[PDB]
Amino acid sequence: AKKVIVGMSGGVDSSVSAWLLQQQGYQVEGLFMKNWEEDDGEEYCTAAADLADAQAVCDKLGIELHTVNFAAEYWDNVFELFLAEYKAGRTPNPDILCNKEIKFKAFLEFAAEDLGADYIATGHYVRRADVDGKSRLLRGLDSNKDQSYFLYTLSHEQIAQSLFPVGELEKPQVRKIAEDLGLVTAKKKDSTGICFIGERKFREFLGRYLPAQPGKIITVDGDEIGEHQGLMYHTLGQRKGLGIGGTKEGTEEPWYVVDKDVENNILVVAQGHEHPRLMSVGLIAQQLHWVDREPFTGTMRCTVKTRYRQTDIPCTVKALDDDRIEVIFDEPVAAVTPGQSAVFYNGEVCLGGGIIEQRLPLPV
RNA sequence: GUCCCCUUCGUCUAGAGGCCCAGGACACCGCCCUUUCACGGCGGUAACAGGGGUUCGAAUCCCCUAGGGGACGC
Incomplete structure (x- = not known):
């Protein structure tokens, strides 16, 4: 009967995930991280109530819910480097560190240093299998829907001390077990956008943490074609936002990005979801x-x-x-x-x- | 001023009197998909330069005013 602190997010996953340990025996307490200081209000509530959803499940389950505020380190070790590499005209995966610097360190740490437990558990639909003495990572069933990708940073150590319940189930099941138990979360937008941050529309979000200088858009044939308005706003293989509307000698195909020209502040496009460049x-x-x-x-x-x-x-x-x-x-x-x-x-x-x-x- | 051609949704265009209250594509907008950014799927909005004629009927035919041509545009 070890202690298990599951990260309650107020998400359908998590919930089923705790109740599964609860059943599985384990002493189960959950913690809810508040790691982003929303600027707006329409944004607050959205994530404020996301808590009441979190709690109301721990209660319907009979579990204590712990509040924590790593927001301090979120920015410190994540959102900061986030904006960095972006400014440098590259495409960074915030979430990919959201797990490396917090959900599996910042959290994990505060698990025993305070909450005092001997097993952390996220609802990450992935699985853990220990063998030959080394704790190993591995994607769950329901192949299609799975999150192994977001946790390549983890180590056996970290993993080993973590518990991944649902990664064994199959998404439809999970979203149901919850519906049956009655967990308020069942029937809730699986979730999108930067982890912890809202599913808001990028351009406005990113265009509020960095400047805004237009530019030129060029074909792969060194010729003008579009107005590059901005640059960090795009990424190799992006299709939307390039104004282009086909012309005389164009295969009618949609135009896709192919390369950012850092200094010359260019936007090398092309045409065709298969073009060599x-x-x-x-x-x-x-x-x-x-x-x-x-x-x-x-x-x-x-x-x-x-x-x-x-x-x-x-x-x-x-x-x-x-x-x-x-x-x-x-x-x-x-x-x-x-x-x-x-x-x-x-x-x-x-x-x-x-x-x-x-x-x-x-x-x- | 050489007495001939032009103009269609944002854009590239289909259109050679009734089949066009105008079609496609790309864009734009939305939903679905998705814990990054993207891709992808699906669907939606949208135009006959303007005014008159001719025909039972006109985007297309004629006429009128605002954009391009004639190795001489001395």
Whole structure:
């Protein structure tokens, strides 16, 4: 009967997730983090009441709900670096650190230093399986819907001390168990947007943390075409917001981004969700993390994603340094964007990924 | 001033008297999808430069005013 502090978010998942441990035996207490100081009000309530939903489930379950405010560190170790790499015309995955710096550190820490427990549990639809003495990470069932990608930063240690209940179920079940128990959360917007921050519309959110200087938009044929109004507002393979409306000698295809020109403040577009300047045969990842937490030397042979919910695309990996890696896409990959993370899997297992900083241009 | 061609949704256009209260594409807007940003799916809004004629009927035919052509536009 160990102590288990589950992160109550007021989300359908979490809820079912606690009740599952509760049943599973465990002493179950839940904590609700408040990590973002909303500027607006329409935003507050939304996340304020998101708490009453959280609590009202702990009560209907008979569990104490703990308040905490890591908002301090959220900005400190996440949203800050967030805006950083963005300013640098790259696409960062806030959420990807939202787990590395908080939900599995900041939290985990405060679990025993205060709450005094010996098992943290998120509702992350992923699973944990210990073997040969090393705690291993691995995506749950319901393949389609799964979050292994967001936790490549975790280590066996961290994982081991964590509990992932629902990752065993299948999404429809979860969203139901809750409906049956009566948990107020069942029937609630699965959730979107930066973790902790609201599902608001980007352009207005990002355009409130950085400047706003227009520019020019060029075809892949070094010729004017559109008004680049802004730049951080886009990303390789983006389609919307490029004003373009086809012209005389255009395949009617929609236009997609292909490269940001940092200094010349350009916006190299093209045309066709398959155009050569939107594919690669590999890339190079830096800031690496292996759940295994073993040093990586030599050559590997696995699969790899390059954006959330992408699709296990075969690849070969070889060490290019003590921090960088050179992977080679078994087939061209679409819009490998720099800044996003690249998680490699060895099947059921998720070996952990790393940050992309270099794609591998398609041969002419 | 050489007495001939032009003009369609935001944009690129379909349209050669009744089938067009105008069609597609891209854009734009929305929903769905999704704990990043994106992709994707689905659907919606939207135009005959303007005024007269001719026909049972006109986007298309004629006429009238605001944009482009004639190796001489001395």
